[PDB]
Point group: C10
Chain length 115, copies 10
């Protein structure tokens, strides 16, 4: 499918489930297309194909169902927040004001004001 | 219709419904034109054709009706807000101050201050 | 009328009503000229012709009448505000701080602080 | 009058009234000169001629009289404020922070916090 | 007088009164020189001649007298403030944040919060 | 494995444990790939291979388990916060506002206001 | 005196009084040198000669005496503040945020909040 | 060792202690490598070798032990804070806002508000 | 003395007193060197010679003595503050936000809020 | 010593005391090297030699001793703060916002609000 076709589902259905799950977990678009649909990027307009598959009625319904079926503890739980802030702290590409603010917020969260 | 004609409706009516629904859901203009009306972009002035079809009395009336007929729980419900903030968190193109602020707001929302 | 003439009304009167209505609804100038008066842009100074037709006594009086005759619920009602903020959220051209602030305000409005 | 002459009034008096009225309504200078005095711009220094006619004793006195004679409801009344903010909202050239702030203020004004 | 001479007064005295009055009303320097003393600009250093005539004892004394003799209602009265803010609002060269702030302050002044 | 293959685990399993541990400790991606998988960077798209191995079901499950199994005292304890702020203070590449803020926060934490 | 000589006073004494008075009134240096000492600028280093004459013991003592002898009503009295803010308002070179702030402060001062 | 080898310890053990101590005192990485391991920089990727030696299990364990064994008075004691702020004050490369803020904080700390 | 020699005092002692006094009054370095030691700048590194003479034990002791011997009314007394703010107001090179803030502070100081 | 050698002390010991004293007083590094060790800069990497001599155990111990032996009145006493702020005020290279803030803080300190 190198064209821009919304309705071609029920033939490639297992691939659409991987895309829906990876998207509902929260990772961005664009790349997930590279992951699941290979290097079909730059076929025509890549954004066109991406948002064309982003508009399937099958997509929309299954995405809404899976999104509403996930409890709000597999998306944001305290330990993941600590890990994300720590990732931002230890990355030497985040500029320095952002690292300072991340240290501030890790300080505020875990009552670590010298105690 | 490669011209800029407001009133040519009642001949292409199913296409106007897809456009109205996709727009009322909230996605931007410009691209939705690429989606539903193919690659007729850059025919003349693309913005001219877009806002010419954006000014149909048929458009305006049906858009207002469908917009007022949608309950305020298919546009913004808490779980969609969590998913959008998480999308902004896990995207490595959002600069770093925005990611920090998104983490802050996800922190504030779900009472996740170490509890 | 490729010149800059204020008083030439009562001959083209139906076109002036479309312009007045589209302007009173709130959309910007410049383009509405492209819409209703074709591609007569860049005839001389486009801004000159635009603000020359923007200064007709007939214009001013009818614009004031139609503007004062519109109830303040066809301009800003809550559901339109929700739709505009959602448009700004789902547009991937709005930079990232603006998207974060739009999410914040949609959060504040519809009491959606985890409830 | 392609020179820079303050006192040449009482010969061109109807043109000076249109200029005074358009200026007292609040629109900017520079262009109003293009409107009422044709394309005599760039004759010498355009700003020189503009502020030379801006310094006539006849001008000053009539401008002060007409400015003090206008009630403060033909300049700023609530419905005009709503229309101006809406113009700023629907213009796709206003950057995105300004549009967000305009939405905020339209929100604050018309008690539209979900009610 | 194409030189830089402070004391040459009592010969050109009517011109010095126009300059003093235009300056005491509040308009900037530089141009007022163009207005009253023609196009003698760029003779030598224009700023040199301007601030040389700005330092006459005759100037200083008459300027102080006329400045202290003007009541504080020909400089700033409410209606002039409304007109200046409206000028800043309707000028399409003022950037967009300044226009928003001007609308805010016009809102604050004339108790126009939906009332 | 110079391709982009998610499921090739159970053959290289000890390498996946080092990656999981180094990532769960908080250091960034990209480099950890250089560390554990040599200089296989720029094989194709490096980000593609990185986030392809970042999407293994085996990865996800083991990463979640190890992340939830680590007590919140091997990630952020007070002495590590002091050391990180001190690192930011003594690094002559952090610009000067960030160093000032780091000194401020080290001041605030350890009650060192002249006492 | 095209050199840089501090002590050459008591020969040119009337010129030093004009300089002291113009400086004590508050106008900047550099130009006052152009005014009183002609176009001797760029002789060597202009700043060198300026601050060399700025360091005379005769200068310092007379400057201190004249500065302490001036009452604090020939430097800042309310009407001069109004005139300076008005100058900043009516100058079309002051950018637009500064003009807005000047209007704000003129508003705050003269109790002109619609009264 | 011009390669990138984690486990080569117990042969060069005294050098690893100097590195651990200098790092635990708080000075940055990169240079400490230049200090203790000579000019082996730019062998391959310098950051690669640096963070490869930064990931030794021997390193990690000894670094954690020495870091937890240092009392919080050899890292930040009041007199060191005064010295660091004074260093930032007397350095003519710190820009001017940072110097002003450093003076402010030195003012706040040592109760030096004219007393 | 075109070299960089700290101890050469007791031969040139009157020059060192002028430097100490001019520095203790508060004017910057660099230029004072031009003033008292002629045009010996750019001999080698000018900053090197300047801070070499800035490090004499004789210098340090006499500078400390003279600095501690000056009462805190020859450095900052109210009338000097008024004069400095007025200098900043009347200088047309200070940008416009700084001039506005200077007017604000002169307003705040001398109780000149319309009284 | 044109190499990078930490331990070569007890031969050049008087030079190390001057360096320690000048550093403990608070002046920056880099230049102090130029002062005490001549023009040996750019021998290899200047920063390398500087921080190599900055890491001597003899250095560290004597620096700590001398730093802890200095009373907190030879580093920051009120009169030095007044002198530093005055230096920043009278330097015409400090930009204008910094000068304004320095005037503000000198105002705040010495109770000089018109009294």
């Amino acid at each position: 499918q190198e064209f821009a076709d919304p309705h071609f589902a029920a033939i490639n259905q297992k691939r659409f489930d991987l895309y829906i799950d990876l998207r509902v977990q929260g990772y961005s678009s664009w790349r997930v297309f590279r992951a699941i649909w290979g290097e079909e990027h730059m076929d025509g307009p890549a954004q066109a194909r991406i948002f064309a598959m982003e508009s399937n009625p099958y997509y929309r319904k299954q995405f809404k169902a899976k999104l509403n079926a996930t409890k709000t503890s597999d998306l944001w739980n305290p330990k993941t927040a600590l890990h994300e802030l720590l990732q931002m702290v230890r990355d030497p590409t985040v500029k320095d004001s952002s690292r300072l603010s991340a240290i501030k917020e890790l300080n505020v969260l875990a009552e670590i004001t010298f105690v």
